[PDB]
């Protein structure tokens, strides 16, 4: 049993390597568990727009989403892969 964790910031490139991992391992007659989609994490950073104190209290909100998908069986830039036992 091997659990493959896949974490990326873009779902398109994360599911692209996820489909190729399932399809690439399904042809080897390996019983694999479907892609378990972990709850997405949004890294919130609400900063002050102005570099001084004269702005009209205008804040800018930033987000950095980290999608996590794990594959349990029995790579593009921006995707992290980590296999376990």
């Amino acid at each position: 049993r091997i659990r493959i964790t896949l974490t990326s910031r873009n779902v398109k490139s994360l599911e692209k390597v996820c489909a190729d991992l399932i399809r690439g391992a399904k042809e080897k007659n390996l019983k694999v568990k479907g892609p378990v989609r972990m709850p997405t994490k949004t890294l919130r950073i609400t900063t002050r727009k102005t570099p001084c104190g004269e702005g009209s209290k205008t804040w800018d909100r930033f987000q950095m989403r980290i999608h996590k998908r794990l594959i349990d069986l029995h790579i593009e830039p921006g995707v992290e892969v980590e296999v376990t036992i």
């Binding site: 609400t46 009209s56 209290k57 205008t58 804040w59």
Partner: protein, 134 residues
């Protein structure tokens, strides 16, 4: 022979497990008339007082609730119980009895079978809440 229908308030998700048997209606193991807010006790009994106990005397209902507040769970429980009987009368009873139940629950209050999409709005900077400002 059982269905599992959910009723959703703001954040209160109540799922009723309408299963054949006797007239049992419980929420998280506790009877329906034993929920803590007694002021909203009639809101939970509206599906029973309108449709009559004879329609519920053949199905057990066990509602599981989580999320929202006290009042949100009240409107989510009565909605789950209302739709669980409708979904039961649709898959195991004739469709004529389903319309006989829906027309009674819809004409009284549409919120028993249709959840309202009202949710809390996001707060904007420069104000204490969504609309209000400093």
């Amino acid at each position: 022979q059982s269905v599992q229908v959910f009723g959703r308030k703001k954040t209160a998700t109540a799922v009723a497990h309408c299963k054949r048997g006797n007239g049992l209606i419980k929420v998280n193991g506790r009877p329906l008339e034993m929920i803590e807010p007694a002021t909203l006790q009639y809101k939970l009994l509206e599906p029973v007082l309108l449709l009559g106990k004879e329609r519920f005397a053949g199905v057990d209902i066990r509602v599981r609730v989580k999320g929202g507040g006290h009042v949100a769970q009240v409107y989510a429980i009565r909605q789950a119980i209302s739709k669980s009987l409708v979904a039961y009368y649709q898959k195991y009873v004739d469709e004529a009895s389903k319309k006989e139940i829906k027309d009674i629950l819809i004409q009284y209050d549409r919120t028993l079978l249709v959840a309202d999409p009202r949710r809390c709005e996001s707060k904007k900077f420069g104000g204490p809440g969504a609309r209000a400002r400093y």
